[PDB]
Design a protein around this nucleic acid. Structure first.
Length: 228
DNA sequence: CCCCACCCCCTTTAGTACTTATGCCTGGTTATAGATACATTGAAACCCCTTTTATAGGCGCCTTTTTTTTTT
């Protein structure tokens, strides 16, 4: 069946983002480790790497502010709570059947339930308190073998983690849980050859633009999307 | 170091008011089928042509004659 490589990708906090992360005490600070430009660049690189392989990729964001900043910047479709049934089905049908559209962004509305589509790669932008078990379930529902029976791994799960933030605490936990569940698991601190790609936020000024936008957000913007 | 108090959260479900689509029925004029106005080519139906020899009324129409009225 699907043979899944699980990885955490540890990304340093940009010093400007780390500065504010410390100073801010309300849940607003979650947005600084979520939008950290090193983490965005890692996500962007992984989408490029996998799209070159014609893999299908779902990127999960539990936070709507982040869902849009990522998807719109990377020019990928996104689905969340207010997305109409018609537009949602357009996007899912595109993901499933149109070879030009192989990456989509989905929020907490994905699990569960509408029918999560199948993919070969699942990237989680964030990690939080506290459901290790909902993560493995979603991984299981989404990931299908890329049709590479010879290969060691034919599907891929990545969880992006910001260093020096509360995100890391969730890591020793996730690693233990996933391996105990029978998964191959590793920690990636440096993505081989990100410097051969043209990724966003190469300049301090572009990072500062995003930083201003994050600082303008409120504690409400840093809550997970809730849905019943 | 231990106990008590305060702060922040997610749980999902029940209310009636408000908006959108479907069925409702309703006022023009347009598209159909056949007959009417009628007009078509077709045909049949119609009177018309050749005269005679006698009888004797009525018929209408002609130019010349006589009488009456008008004007000078």
């Amino acid at each position: 069946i699907a043979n899944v490589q699980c990885a955490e990708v540890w990304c340093p906090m940009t010093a400007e983002f780390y500065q504010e992360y410390l100073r801010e005490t309300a849940r607003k600070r979650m947005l600084l480790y979520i939008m950290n430009p090193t983490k965005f660049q890692a996500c962007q690189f992984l989408i490029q790497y996998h799209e070159r392989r014609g893999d299908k990729i779902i990127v999960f964001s539990d936070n709507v502010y982040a869902l849009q900043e990522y998807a719109l910047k990377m020019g990928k479709p996104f689905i969340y709570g207010s997305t109409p049934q018609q537009e949602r089905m357009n996007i899912l049908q595109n993901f499933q059947y149109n070879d030009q559209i192989n990456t989509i962004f989905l929020s907490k509305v994905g699990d569960t339930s509408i029918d999560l589509p199948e993919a070969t790669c699942l990237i989680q932008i964030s990690s939080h308190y506290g459901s290790r078990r909902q993560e493995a379930q979603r991984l299981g529902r989404i990931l299908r073998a890329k049709r590479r029976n010879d290969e060691g791994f034919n599907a891929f799960f990545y969880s992006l983690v910001s260093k020096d933030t509360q995100e890391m605490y969730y890591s020793t936990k996730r690693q233990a849980f996933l391996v105990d569940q029978g998964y191959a698991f590793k920690v990636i601190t440096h993505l081989h050859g990100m410097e051969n790609p043209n990724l966003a936020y190469a300049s301090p000024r572009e990072r500062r633009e995003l930083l201003q936008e994050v600082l303008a957000g409120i504690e409400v913007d840093a809550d997970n999307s809730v849905g019943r």
